């Protein structure tokens, strides 16, 4: 149930 902003749309930093 995770949000896409934190998982699939997240990137390296």
């Amino acid at each position, epitope marked *: *149930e*995770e*949000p*896409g*902003s*934190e998982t*699939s*749309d*997240a*990137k*390296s*930093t």
Partner: antibody
Framework: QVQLQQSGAEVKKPGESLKISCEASGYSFTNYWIGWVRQMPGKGLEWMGIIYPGDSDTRYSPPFQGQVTITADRSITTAYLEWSSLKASDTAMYYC??????????????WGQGTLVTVSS | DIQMTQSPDSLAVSLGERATINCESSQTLLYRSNKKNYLAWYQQKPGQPPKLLISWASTPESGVPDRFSGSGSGTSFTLTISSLQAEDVAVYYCQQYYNSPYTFGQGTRLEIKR
């Protein structure tokens, strides 16, 4: 300070191609998602799509996926929104906006001033 | 995709009185790991771009007046102007940023009631 300077207001005809720009500054261009928002005359905001300039990876909504192409350039820190063939329905205000936090999806902050694209025969 | 539905479409509140702008999402915006509602409110005044008012449902930006406040969790949400002023006349939009596409609501036009 963070600024998102956009191109001037366009007046085109149906069938013509167009490429509106958004010159970003005051932050690391690669590390944030940057996107586009449509607002037609006397209507609400419509989330078109975003792009991550670190690897040119894009996202769209179903109305605008297939209709437009969101690209970017790292050397000049400029995001784009491209039409191959304009229509009369594309007459709208096109706001540019960076996502509010680095390396992740999110709310838009800050926004650009906007580009009045007008399409008519 | 997630559909955002605000209520009402147009709102008329008198100067001094409480303005209540709701926003109902189709599926839940609360994430149980960090306990954060992934919702942002916006203020678009006439002839200007949209300005960020509130992020994370209940965290306003720096410079926003105290009369403005954002409440609710999960599906149901609310923007609350406790005492309306003349400057507050604007179209207000909610937006989820849980899953892409990060869709907006249709918008709530706030006018002065006389």
């Amino acid at each position: 300070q963070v600024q998102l300077q956009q191109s001037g207001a366009e007046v085109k005809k149906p069938g013509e191609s167009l490429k509106i720009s958004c010159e970003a500054s005051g932050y690391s261009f690669t590390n944030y998602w940057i996107g586009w928002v449509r607002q037609m005359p006397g209507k609400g905001l419509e989330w078109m799509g975003i792009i991550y300039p670190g690897d040119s990876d894009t996202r769209y909504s179903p109305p605008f996926q297939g209709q437009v192409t969101i690209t970017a350039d790292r050397s000049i820190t400029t995001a784009y929104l491209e039409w191959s063939s304009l229509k009369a329905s594309d007459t709208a205000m096109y706001y540019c906006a960076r996502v509010g936090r680095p390396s992740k999806g999110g709310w838009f902050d800050p926004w650009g001033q906007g580009t009045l694209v007008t399409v008519s025969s | 995709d997630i559909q955002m539905t605000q209520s009402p479409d147009s709102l008329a509140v008198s100067l001094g009185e409480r303005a209540t702008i709701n926003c109902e999402s189709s599926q839940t915006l609360l994430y149980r790991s960090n306990k954060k509602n992934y919702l942002a409110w916006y203020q678009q005044k006439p002839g200007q771009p949209p300005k960020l008012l509130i992020s994370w449902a209940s965290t306003p930006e720096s410079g926003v007046p105290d009369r403005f406040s954002g409440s609710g969790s999960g599906t149901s949400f609310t923007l609350t102007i406790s005492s309306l002023q003349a400057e507050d006349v604007a179209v207000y939009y909610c937006q989820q940023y849980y899953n892409s596409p990060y869709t907006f609501g249709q918008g709530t036009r706030l006018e002065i009631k006389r």
